[PDB]
Amino acid sequence: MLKKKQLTVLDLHPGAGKTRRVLPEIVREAIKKRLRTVILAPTRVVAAEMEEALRGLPVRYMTTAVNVTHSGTEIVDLMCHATFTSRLLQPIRVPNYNLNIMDEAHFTDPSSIAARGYISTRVEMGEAAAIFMTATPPGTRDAFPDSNSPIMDTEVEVPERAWSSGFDWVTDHSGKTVWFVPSVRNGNEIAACLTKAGKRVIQLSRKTFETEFQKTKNQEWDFVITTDISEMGANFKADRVIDSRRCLKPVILDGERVILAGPMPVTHASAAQRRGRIGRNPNKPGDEYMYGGGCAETDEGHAHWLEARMLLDNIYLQDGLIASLYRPEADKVAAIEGEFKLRTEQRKTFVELMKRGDLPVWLAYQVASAGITYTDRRWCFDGTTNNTIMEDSVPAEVWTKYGEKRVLKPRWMDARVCSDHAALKSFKEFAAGKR
Numbered sequence: 319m320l321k322k323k324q325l326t327v328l329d330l331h332p333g334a335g336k337t338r339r340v341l342p343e344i345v346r347e348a349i350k351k352r353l354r355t356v357i358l359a360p361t362r363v364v365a366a367e368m369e370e371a372l373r374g375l376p377v378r379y380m381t382t383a384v385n386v387t388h389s390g391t392e393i394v395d396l397m398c399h400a401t402f403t404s405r406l407l408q409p410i411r412v413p414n415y416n417l418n419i420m421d422e423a424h425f426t427d428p429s430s431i432a433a434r435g436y437i438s439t440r441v442e443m444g445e446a447a448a449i450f451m452t453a454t455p456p457g458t459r460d461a462f463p464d465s466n467s468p469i470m471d472t473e474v475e476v477p478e479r480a481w482s483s484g485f486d487w488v489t490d491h492s493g494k495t496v497w498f499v500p501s502v503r504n505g506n507e508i509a510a511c512l513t514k515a516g517k518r519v520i521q522l523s524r525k526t527f528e529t530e531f532q533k534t535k536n537q538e539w540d541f542v543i544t545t546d547i548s549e550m551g552a553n554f555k556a557d558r559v560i561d562s563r564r565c566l567k568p569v570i571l572d573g574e575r576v577i578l579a580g581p582m583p584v585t586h587a588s589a590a591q592r593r594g595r596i597g598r599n600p601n602k603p604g605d606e607y608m609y610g611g612g613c614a615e616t617d618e619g620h621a622h623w624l625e626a627r628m629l630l631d632n633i634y635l636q637d638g639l640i641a642s643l644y645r646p647e648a649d650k651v652a653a654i655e656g657e658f659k660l661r662t663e664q665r666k667t668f669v670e671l672m673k674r675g676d677l678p679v680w681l682a683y684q685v686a687s688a689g690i691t692y693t694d695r696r697w698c699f700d701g702t703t704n705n706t707i708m709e710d711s712v713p714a715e716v717w718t719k720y721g722e723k724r725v726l727k728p729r730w731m732d733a734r735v736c737s738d739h740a741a742l743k744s745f746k747e748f749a750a751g752k753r
């Protein structure tokens with residue numbers, strides 16, 4: 319695996335021990351061979367689980383998620399996928415790692431796709447080796463892979479709204495259920511319905527995942543209601559998954575705005591990872607997977623692959639060369655390579671809008687490429703009437719940094735800035751000049 323110009327897909331089935339058994343063996347061999355190695359975790363939660371898997375091995379944990387005192391001598395780094403891509407974009411020296419290991423390498427967030435494109439390009443150049451660890455590589459067509467224990471798979475109508483009758487199987491269950499919903503707002507409705515029926519519910523989404531995931535260990539629960547973020551190595555002591563088989567797809571319309579289309583079917587990879595939360599214990603056969611729809615390749619034309627091109631166009635590789643997406647996921651976007659390359663100062667603005675600004679990549683790019691500086695929020699108010707953001711059926715309003723009350727009406731409308739109460743609160747703070 320560890321030889322230059324090799325990219326290995328470690329595609330053992332979910333729960334086969336890729337992280338707890340195989341990874342430490344790879345790391346030991348890498349240190350022996352004096353390979354400068356990076357290990358990429360999808361989330362802080364997985365970063366902390368990896369520290370447990372790798373304990374006593376000399377690894378530099380480049381995250382506050384791990385409380386360890388480093389020796390200073392480590393040649394293995396561990397960081398999150400997004401941290402890798404972030405450091406590549408910034409004017410910070412990132413070592414040219416001899417061995418690049420990506421755990422949960424199916425993750426479809428723009429920074430993960432970009433990281434795979436950069437890494438696979440270095441491997442193609444003959445510069446490096448890589449290992450992509452996932453049960454579900456890009457373009458997998460298998461929603462029902464092998465498991466540690468037999469799974470009961472049932473196609474059934476799954477509620478996506480509060481219900482009064484017709485779904486007794488949902489609440490009659492005495493075990494623990496992980497329920498994949500397509501959005502935070504949809505999870506809120508299902509969660510309230512379950513709570514009203516006497517169930518103990520924990521809700522997980524990207525912004526809340528580290529804090530709320532700990533509740534799955536510290537409190538008794540009946541249901542976890544989660545978005546797709548629990549596809550990325552989240553482990554539960556559960557005996558049932560309920561899968562809507564639905565997701566939201568961010569779509570760029572007429573190069574001009576981003577909508578959250580759907581809900582629509584998940585990919586086969588997503589479905590397999592959702593199901594893969596259960597069947598993990600060879601001593602507990604007959605975990606249940608209840609699924610409410612079919613799969614489709616909804617990653618085609620999904621904004622995250624164009625956003626990944628925006629990131630890669632702005633990462634130095636060698637002279638004017640630009641890293642390609644990882645070949646198996648490269649046709650998910652129609653882009654001209656280099657079309658999003660920004661000059662140094664617009665690039666710094668683009669980076670700051672994504673990090674400090676917490677804006678979606680697409681929206682950060684529209685603002686930075688327009689020659690707007692990071693602190694200039696006039697664009698949050700001067701859009702068309704149809705760009706008016708609504709909050710409880712009234713136009714959303716903020717006090718501008720000038721002290722003027724204005725309707726939020728961004729020049730570029732990205733539905734991700736107002737997809738739920740938390741998102742809109744963050745965007746209101748941004749529009750007001752508060753970060």
Ligand SMILES: COc1ccc(C)cc1NC(=O)CN
Pocket residue numbers: 398400401402403404405407429629672673676
């Ligand atoms: C929302 O945060 C980001 C936005 C954009 C990029 C490329 C990375 C990050 N996150 C990190 O760098 C976390 N350490």
Ligand SMILES: COc1ccc(C)cc1NC(=O)CN
Pocket residue numbers: 325434435436438439442641642643644645646
């Ligand atoms: C020669 O190109 C390839 C052939 C096959 C595979 C798996 C990857 C690449 N290259 C890339 O994916 C560059 N990002």
